[PDB]
Paper text:
Bet v 2 is a plant profilin panallergen, i.e., it is ubiquitously distributed throughout nature and shares a highly conserved amino acid sequence of up to 75% even between distantly-related organisms. Additionally to its ability to bind actin, profilins also interact with poly-l-proline and phosphoinositides. In this study, we present crystal structures of Bet v 2 in the reduced (without disulfide bridge) and the oxidized (with disulfide bridge) states at a resolution of 2.0 and 1.7 Å respectively. The reduced and oxidized structures were determined at a high resolution of 2.0 Å and 1.7 Å, respectively. Both structures share a central six-stranded antiparallel β-sheet with two N- and the C-terminal α-helices flanking the sheet at one side and a third helix flanking the sheet on the opposite side.
While the overall structure was conserved between these two forms, the crystal structures revealed marked differences near the N- and C-terminal segments, which are linked by the disulfide bridge Cys13-Cys117. In the oxidized form, the N-terminal segment is disulfide linked to the C-terminal helix, which adopts a strained conformation enforced by the disulfide bond. The poly-l-proline binding sites of Bet v 2 map onto the immediate neighborhood of the Cys13-Cys117 disulfide bond, providing a direct link between the differences in proline binding with the differences in the crystal structures of both Bet v 2 forms. Hence, the apparent higher binding ability to poly-l-proline of the oxidized Bet v 2 can be explained by the conformational selection principle: the likelihood for the ligand to find the receptor in a conformation suitable for binding is increased if the conformational space of the receptor is restricted by a disulfide bridge. In this work, we showed that cathepsin S degrades the reduced form of Bet v 2 rapidly, whereas the processing of the oxidized form is sufficiently retarded. Given the significantly higher proteolytic resistance of oxidized Bet v 2, we suggest that this form is the sensitizing allergen. Importantly, however, the two redox forms differed strongly with respect to their proteolytic resistance, which can have major impacts on the immunologic properties of Bet v 2 for several reasons: firstly, given the long storage times of birch pollen proteins before the contact with a patient, the preferential degradation of the reduced Bet v 2 will accumulate the oxidized Bet v 2 form, resulting in a preferential exposure of patients with the more stable oxidized Bet v 2 form.
Author numbering: 2 to 133
Write the structure that this text describes.
Amino acid sequence: SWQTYVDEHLMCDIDGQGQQLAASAIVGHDGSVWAQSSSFPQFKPQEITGIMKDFEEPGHLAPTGLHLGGIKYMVIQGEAGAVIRGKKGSGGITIKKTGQALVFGIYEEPVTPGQCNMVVERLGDYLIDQGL
């Protein structure tokens, strides 16, 4: 199906298989969902607007926190205009910007930052190399 293909060939695939602890998504710059893991949260349009703004001005979200699905993440050091990172509890969030889209990964213990980040980098490079 489309969603098994998404869960298998694209989104964070942490053992379970697909245990609820890790989730990822590809979201257009305009806030439309291109693909998301079965566990990925619903999010609000203005959360995407604020994230896009932080890619233009890194640290835009730091005083208020970064919100996704209503959850507040503390902004940490990222890569200006390319990657946003945030922490919450035992996990966090990584967002990579591509030409037309954003790649999200959300993780919690025992999923590690490195595990999630490897998937987010992989999907972002795949999109960028397709021209997206």
